[PDB]
């Protein structure tokens, strides 16, 4: 009602839409380093024996 609204609103994604309105999945990778010993290291390839 007047001065009353549902805060979430949809993106209404639809194919016949331009590049501006098209789904763009986002993956924000972050790197956390603390004083505890590190456990997520990196393949470290080697040499033949």
């Amino acid at each position: 009602g007047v001065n009353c609204y549902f805060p979430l609103q949809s993106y209404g994604f639809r194919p016949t839409y331009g590049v501006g309105h098209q789904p763009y999945r986002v993956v924000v990778l972050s790197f956390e380093l603390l004083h505890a010993p590190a456990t997520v290291c990196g393949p470290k390839k080697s040499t033949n024996l």
């Binding site: 603390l34 004083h35 505890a36 010993p37 590190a38 456990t39």
Partner: protein, 44 residues
């Protein structure tokens, strides 16, 4: 044990108060977590 930023667990399961037999505990787990531990309990 927890000394150098790693948490170490040694263990051994031996057949049968405490006997006079000698047995050394083999290292099982060496976790890299770096939290401070000063108290503990047991879980039943």
């Amino acid at each position: 044990k927890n000394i150098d930023g790693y948490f170490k667990i040694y263990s051994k399961h031996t057949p049968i108060d405490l006997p006079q037999g000698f047995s050394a505990l083999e290292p099982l787990v060496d976790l890299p977590i770096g939290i401070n531990i000063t108290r503990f309990q047991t879980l039943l």
